[PDB]
Amino acid sequence: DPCECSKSGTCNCGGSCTCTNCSCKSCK
Ligand SMILES: [Cd+2]
Ligand SMILES: [Cd+2]
C-alpha cells in the first residue's frame, strides 16, 4: 500500500508528518 501522499495524489506533509511509510523531502 502506497503512502496517502502518492495514493491520494496531493501530498499534505506541510508542517508535521503523520502518514506512514512516507518518502517526501518536505518531511524526511
Ligand atoms: Cd508527503
Ligand atoms: Cd511525510
Ligand SMILES: [Cd+2]
Ligand atoms: Cd505520506
